[PDB]
């Protein structure tokens, strides 16, 4: 029994000062008429005070007009004072009410009919007419934007010399094409038009419109996008009269002498409506609970500090300092009326300043971070810098477990997940199957689970800490609009107290999402002002969510729900990738500079660089007991009773049983029955632990936990691990399984008993025949199923596009962002409706995207200056020397293109003019790299591997003078090969040193199975490779003449010489004596057969 | 690109 490090027992309270634990004559003119005071003129009724002198009358408008003394009634429906209408007035577009308020084109509209004497083109919205006379039908020119006019059962001709062929089979003169107008209804004349740029007299909208300057701020949307009526384009700054002046009600500035001088200098009495009455002293209108101040002419209230003023300008409200300004108190903050209290989380002591929280533990934190080949051991102050592991492929992410001191990491090259104790013992692999592309992982120290994100499958996974019971938790999209979906999931953090999982995505619609650890409550947290969120983490003592952005260059934090986003670094970071929090400090890694930085977590002050790195640092964690806070496991014992995964409920109060992927979650009231439901291409373990792929069955290693994977009576394993074995012993790749093509020589790979219940991956769709294809290949106008079941017209008409995607008219499904991007992604232009794309609903995000000049395409700002035609206008590359590169992380090429510094001297051209790879000094090879003669750095694992990696065999020298890693087998020539390939029956050393000393594999002396010829040097080759002219085994026994007598000759492939050897056809008449007898060069075969 | 691991 112990008191937890720096903490107190659960039955005690902790004094925050030190940390000590304590116990808890009208000429007959009167019929509807009045007099004009003239002997010949008569005012008709209602026309007096109409606003116009309609008659020469002196009683018309002598300021006797009452606007709304008597108003119109429902007998003539009212729309404005003195103006009322009915009938078809209410929606016709005529100026009825004097201001078109008679309809406003809103009320009682959107319901119409058209007579039979006309033709109703109903497919037109009220701005376009929907009824044209029958004479207009096929009169010669169209009148509806629907444009069925000229195509309603009417003929055509074979075009004209000066006309353009529209897609609707009609021709029109070429002067109308590329003019930004629908001259044949379907915009066919507008497809592929490189519109000219706008001139000085023309304002340019978001979409290419080239509108003249008159309509700018004319309060009418003329661009279609509202670009001509932007709020900040029509910006009217407030005239303030700052110095000893005064701001009149009408906007005038007058000098101080012109205030309270009994003269209206402002023409609105703003300087004289006062001067002697003190409303603050009125003590009745002041109503200020706090103090008041009566200026020259009027009063105002003013709140005491800790209180905020609001709309009423009289009252005060307590500021919620712990939410409005969390920067005040490190760690927990408690709001009070008019003030606040800072409290340190348990385990931290409150320094007397009231704002510093110091860790009470005696354990000193350090940073574990990963490079390409290395996991490294760096203290928080940067003083000590050592290596934890080396020789790893690509450590893209890692995490640690406090409970039993294990380190977990993802090797993105081998696509495996490993774990190891922090004393560098018991290194083992837990996940080595599927795992197309894992990017970020997090270890659940509470419920003893592992979570990770897959980028290719676009999924969130969960697994046990030993790797068993893999389950797919989240997929597809996260919001109800289906706007934000799994595109490039990167960065993951857990909050077991609330039972949530947080992750970020740098796809086109970048967001930060939250989900329950059982998958129930997926939602969007941050979705605005975010482009490349590569980093995410939580401060557990503050319930603050920290994330970074590689494009906008900021580090920002907000509450757990996503409100109150406070910026720490105002976009000055080149390219952060991962970050972590401890006490009051942010640690993060930059890719452009390849450095690990450090700074204050609330304002970024004290920024210092901890260390360089020759490779990009990916993942960083502060290893300390405080970074994984102690709480009680909801699945107390027996996994809460579940036979499979016990997962924490959202909110962190309950728990939920769940089953692995290939299982059915059959629900009862007492139990969730996990009934295995694996496909016919999988093998089920006897104890129902898991269903493994069928090619793992009887492969020589125990894949099943109970040992049922390797029963006694299954045939000798010919193939390697991870290869499928046909019934006759020949070998095929697993992808050959049920691909509708005969790979096995006997068709073992396509048996109905194997492929009848075959199931495809989550990112692939199954054809009519069981072949699996990627889902993006369906309805793509190419036969991919070999029976055209992916391109079936009925299937394409009935299918539904994946969430977050958009379906074309021809059944093609494309990403949502590809819609309205001035590109024919659908082939039939169904994704580019000009009337809809040119609307404000498809604007470019001012914060992050750039708008092309002559069209409506939006591109991300990081595509500018890149050297590519991102806008089809080529308008994102013009004059791009004006933009400045980043002050510290960007190297500028000679052609004014900015590139990240990490690409400088990387060995490849990234500018185009090769200015980055010039004046270049070769870099220093790191700890586990080996340096070639030409100063190139290669992994040390590549030395003496029988491959010319440097380019001149500089890494292949003096191999027999050295040993190698213990997992390898050293050949006679000194080269090293993995141990598993040694004593396996095939020559893997080029000298065949392996298999040259292994004992008999059988008792009757035979080294190889009877089906295969065994060479005298104890290697096995397949019997049809014999006598083929190739030394398939180094002893030459597979080409010896005498033992080659027992073979026929295949005339369409081989031809017999004077020697019984039957060389391949291309050696006949080749000019080289191949058989050694000149029979291949007998010239009678080099003529016409 | 510039952000792919």
């Amino acid at each position: 029994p112990t008191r937890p490090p720096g903490m107190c027992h659960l039955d005690e309270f902790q004094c925050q000062g030190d940390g000590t634990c304590i116990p808890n004559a009208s000429h007959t003119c009167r019929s509807n008429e009045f007099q004009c005071l003239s002997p010949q003129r008569c005012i008709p009724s209602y026309w007096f005070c109409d606003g116009e002198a309609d008659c020469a009358d002196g009683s018309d408008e002598p300021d006797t007009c009452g606007h709304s003394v008597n108003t119109c009634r429902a007998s003539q429906f009212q729309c404005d004072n003195g103006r009322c209408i009915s009938g078809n007035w209410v929606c016709d577009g005529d100026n009825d009410c004097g201001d078109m308020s008679d309809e406003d084109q809103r009320h009682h509209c959107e319901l119409q009919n058209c007579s039979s004497t006309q033709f109703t083109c109903v497919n037109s919205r009220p701005p376009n007419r929907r009824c044209i006379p029958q004479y207009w039908v096929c009169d010669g020119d169209a009148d509806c934007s629907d444009a069925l006019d000229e195509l309603q059962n009417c003929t055509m001709r074979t075009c004209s010399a000066g006309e353009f062929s529209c897609a609707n089979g009609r021709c029109v003169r070429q002067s109308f094409r590329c003019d930004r107008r629908n001259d044949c209804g379907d915009y066919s004349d507008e497809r592929g038009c490189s519109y000219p740029p706008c001139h000085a007299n023309q304002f340019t909208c978001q979409n290419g419109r080239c509108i003249p300057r008159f309509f700018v701020c004319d309060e009418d949307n003329d661009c279609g996008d509202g670009s001509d009526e932007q709020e900040h384009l029509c910006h009217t700054p407030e005239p303030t009269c700052p110095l000893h002046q005064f701001r009149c009600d009408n906007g005038h500035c007058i000098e101080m002498g012109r205030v309270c001088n009994h003269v209206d200098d402002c023409s609105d009495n703003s300087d004289e409506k006062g001067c002697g009455i003190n409303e603050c002293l009125d003590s009745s209108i002041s109503r200020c609970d706090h103090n008041c101040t009566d200026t020259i002419t009027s009063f105002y209230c003013s709140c005491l500090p800790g209180y905020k003023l609001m709309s009423d300008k009289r009252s005060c409200v307590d500021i919620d300092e712990c939410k409005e300004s969390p920067q005040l108190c490190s760690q927990k903050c408690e709001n009070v009326v008019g003030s606040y209290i800072c409290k340190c989380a348990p385990g931290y002591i409150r320094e007397p300043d009231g704002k510093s929280c110091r860790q009470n533990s005696n354990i000193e934190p350090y940073l574990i971070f990963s490079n390409r080949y290395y996991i490294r051991n760096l203290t928080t102050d940067g003083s000590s810098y050592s290596l934890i592991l080396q020789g790893l492929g690509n450590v893209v992410a890692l995490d640690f477990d406090r409970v039993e001191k294990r380190l977990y990491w993802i090797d993105a090259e081998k696509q495996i997940i490993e774990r190891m104790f922090l004393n560098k013992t018991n290194r083992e692999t837990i996940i080595n199957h599927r795992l197309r592309r894992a990017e970020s992982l997090a270890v659940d120290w509470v419920s003893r689970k592992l979570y990770w994100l897959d980028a290719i499958l676009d999924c969130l996974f969960v697994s046990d800490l030993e790797g068993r019971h893999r389950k797919m938790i989240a997929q597809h999209c996260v919001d109800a609009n289906n706007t934000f979906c799994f595109e490039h999931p990167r960065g993951i953090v857990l909050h077991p107290q609330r039972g949530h999982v947080y992750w970020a995505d740098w796809g086109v619609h970048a967001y930060i999402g939250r989900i329950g650890m059982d998958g129930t409550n997926k939602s969007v947290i941050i979705s605005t002002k975010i482009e490349w969120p590569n980093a995410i983490t939580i401060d557990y003592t503050n319930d603050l969510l920290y994330w970074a952005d590689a494009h906008l260059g900021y580090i920002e934090f907000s509450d757990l729900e996503g409100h109150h986003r406070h910026t720490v670094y105002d976009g000055s970071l080149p390219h952060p990738f991962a970050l972590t929090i401890f006490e009051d400090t942010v640690f993060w890694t930059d890719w452009n500079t390849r450095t690990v930085e450090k700074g204050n977590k609330y304002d970024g002050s004290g920024r210092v660089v901890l260390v360089n790195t020759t490779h990009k640092p990916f993942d960083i964690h502060v290893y300390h007991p405080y970074r994984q806070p102690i709480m009680s496991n909801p699945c107390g014992t027996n996994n809460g009773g579940c036979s499979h995964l016990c997962l924490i409920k959202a909110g962190g109060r309950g728990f939920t049983c769940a089953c692995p992927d290939d299982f059915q979650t059959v629900q009862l009231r007492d139990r969730t029955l996990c009934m295995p439901m694996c496909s016919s291409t999988q093998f089920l373990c006897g104890n129902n632990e898991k269903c493994i792929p069928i090619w793992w069955k009887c492969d020589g290693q125990k894949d099943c936990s109970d040992g049922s994977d390797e029963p006694d009576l299954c045939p000798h394993r010919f193939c390697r691990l991870g290869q499928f074995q046909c019934r006759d012993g020949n070998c095929t790749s697993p992808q050959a399984l049920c691909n509708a093509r005969q790979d096995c020589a006997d068709g073992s790979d396509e048996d109905r008993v194997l492929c009848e219940h075959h199931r495809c991956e989550s990112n692939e769709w199954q054809c009519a025949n069981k072949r699996c294809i990627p889902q993006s290949w369906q309805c793509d106008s190419v036969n991919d199923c070999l029976d055209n079941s992916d391109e079936d017209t009925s299937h394409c008409a009935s299918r539904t596009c994946r969430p977050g995607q958009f379906k074309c008219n021809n059944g093609r499904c494309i990403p949502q962002s590809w819609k309205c991007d001035v590109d024919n992604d659908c082939g039939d232009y169904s994704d580019e409706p000009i009337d809809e794309c040119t609307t404000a609903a498809y604007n470019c995000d001012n914060h992050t995207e750039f708008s092309c000049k002559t069209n409506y395409r939006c591109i991300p700002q990081w595509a500018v200056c890149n050297g590519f035609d991102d806008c089809r206008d080529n308008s994102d590359e013009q004059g791009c020397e004006s933009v400045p590169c980043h002050p510290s992380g960007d190297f500028r090429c000679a052609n004014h293109h900015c590139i990240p510094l990490r690409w400088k001297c990387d060995g490849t051209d990234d500018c185009g003019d090769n200015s980055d790879e010039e004046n270049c000094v070769p870099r220093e090879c790191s700890e586990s790299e080996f340096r070639c003669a030409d100063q190139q750095c290669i992994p040390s694992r590549w030395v003496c591997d029988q491959e010319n990696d440097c380019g001149d065999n500089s890494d292949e020298r003096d191999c027999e003078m050295k040993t190698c890693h213990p997992e390898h087998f050293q050949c006679t020539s000194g080269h090293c090969v993995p141990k598993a390939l040694a004593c396996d029956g095939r020559a893997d050393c080029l000298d065949a040193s392996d298999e040259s000393a292994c004992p008999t594999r059988f008792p009757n002396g035979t080294y190889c199975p009877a089906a295969m010829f065994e060479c005298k040097n104890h290697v096995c080759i397949q019997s049809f490779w014999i006598c083929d002219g190739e030394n398939d085994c180094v002893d030459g026994s597979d080409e010896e003449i005498h033992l080659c007598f027992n073979i026929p000759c295949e005339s369409p492939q081989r031809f017999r010489c004077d020697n019984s050897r039957c060389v391949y056809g291309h050696q006949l008449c080749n000019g080289v004596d191949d058989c050694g007898d000149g029979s291949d060069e007998k010239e009678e075969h080099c003529r016409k057969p | 690109x510039x952000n792919x691991x």
């Binding site: 209408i85 009915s86 044209i132 004479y135 020119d141 009148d143 | -």
Partner: protein, 72 residues
């Protein structure tokens, strides 16, 4: 140019046909005159001031002939 709904529709055709500008200008002139008459006619419809069909025929007569002099 015109308040009238269906006269705006007719007026667009003559621009598309590129008729004689002087006759085109005169075409706007009488249509502007007619729209006042047309609104006056259907002002009577809400006022109930005609039941003999005069104020409809007089306007469609000119319009029908305008269809001939301008192809409409």
């Amino acid at each position: 140019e015109f308040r009238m709904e269906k006269l705006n529709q007719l007026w667009e055709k003559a621009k598309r046909l590129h008729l004689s500008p002087v006759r085109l200008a005169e075409l706007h002139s009488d249509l502007k005159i007619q729209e006042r008459d047309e609104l006056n006619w259907k002002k009577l419809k809400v006022e109930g001031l005609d039941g003999d069909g005069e104020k409809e025929a007089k306007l469609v007569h000119n319009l029908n002939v305008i269809l001939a002099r301008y192809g409409l």
